[PDB]
């Protein structure tokens, strides 16, 4: 129906009045979603996603229709788009959409993408993450207040003690995501081991409130630090992505002070653009220092001296032919 000029690249856009979020009515159309992404796709969202391969969580007929989690780029796609070869945990490879320009994000939205799921690597170095992900995930009986509390009161002081800087965002669900920008010199195995040592230390400092137990039955009313989010090919909403919630919540980057009193429902595709106006980017300095895993990998070796090694991968998580044997779940 229309051709959009997205930072000098023309992008085809159709069906503006298709309803994606039925509780929002007029405010929950595909047009309002694309309008939201147009509002953020040329700002800090692009910088955070630049050169990353992404997977697309698509809802072509709204969040109550069928869901298509798209990893490989479709065999037929616009000429300008760039792709990057990603390696799945089986060893299989595929051409994934690479975010190189605001038009990349708007094309995704035109295809019904509600949520972008970026890899933790930058192309071309798909071997070494430049990001360690801390996923504070409330289990049944807990919610966002537990997540923000542990994030601000336990995790942030620990990072300060280690000489590390973390950047938090709401997940858009009940949880909190914290990013550590790191030098891309460690592979997925070592970044994940570093995240496990960090998770174990947060758990030691707040054992009544935090768990790393692989078995959900053993977790109780605690936050799970999902250490397996640093494995390959795990869903993880990008900063500024809209989520599959009834009110179209957005994964919102915040400062540590904002997070302390934050409510994730405050940030939606209808509220975020006005909230960003005049406000300093709390993640403005994230790329300013590429940090070493040195402190966390020392914690890993220390844990090995306590008799604490690797933790199990997610259930049925594929493995590569020559990959070292993994730790199996207990019982």
Numbering used by the authors: 6 to 336
Quote the authors verbatim.
One orthologue, MSMEG_6301 (Prim-PolC/LigC Pol/PolD) is encoded in the genomic proximity of two DNA ligase genes (LigC1: msmeg_6302 and LigC2: msmeg_6304). We show that components of the LigC complex act together to preferentially fill in short DNA gaps with ribonucleotides (rNTPs), followed by sealing of the resulting nicks. LigD-deficient cells are also sensitive to oxidative damaging agents, uncovering an unexpected duel role in both excision and DSB repair. Together, these findings establish that the LigC complex operates in excision repair pathways that specifically mends lesions and single-strand breaks in stationary phase. Prim-PolC preferentially binds to and fills-in short DNA gaps.
To define molecular differences between these distinct Prim-Pols, we elucidated the crystal structure of Ms Prim-PolC and compared it to a NHEJ-specific Prim-Pol. Prim-PolC retains the same overall fold of the mycobacterial Prim-PolD (PolDom) structure, which can be superposed with an RMSD of 1.712 Å (over 270 aligned positions, Fig. 5a). Shared structural features include the phosphate recognition pocket containing the conserved basic residues (K23, K35 and N20) that facilitate this key DNA interaction. Despite these similarities, Prim-PolC orthologues possess a strictly conserved C-terminal extension whose function has not been ascribed. In the Prim-PolC structure, we observe that this additional C-terminal region (aa 294–336) consists of a conserved alpha helix (residues G299−R311), which lies across alpha helix 4 after which the peptide chain becomes an unstructured loop. Notably, this structural element, termed Loop 3 (residues G313−P333), is positioned between the two prominent surface loops (1 and 2) that together form a continuous surface on one side of the active site pocket. Apical Loop 1 residues, normally involved in template strand orientation, are not conserved and are instead repurposed for locking Loop 3 into position. Residue P94 packs against a pocket formed of residues Y321, P322, K323 and M324 from Loop 3. Loop 2 residue W219 interacts with Loop 3 residues P316, Y317, P333 and K335 via a mixture of hydrophobic and polar interactions. Again, this has the effect of locking Loop 3 into its current orientation, and also reorients Loop 2 into a more distal position to the active centre, compared to the existing Prim-PolD MMEJ structure.
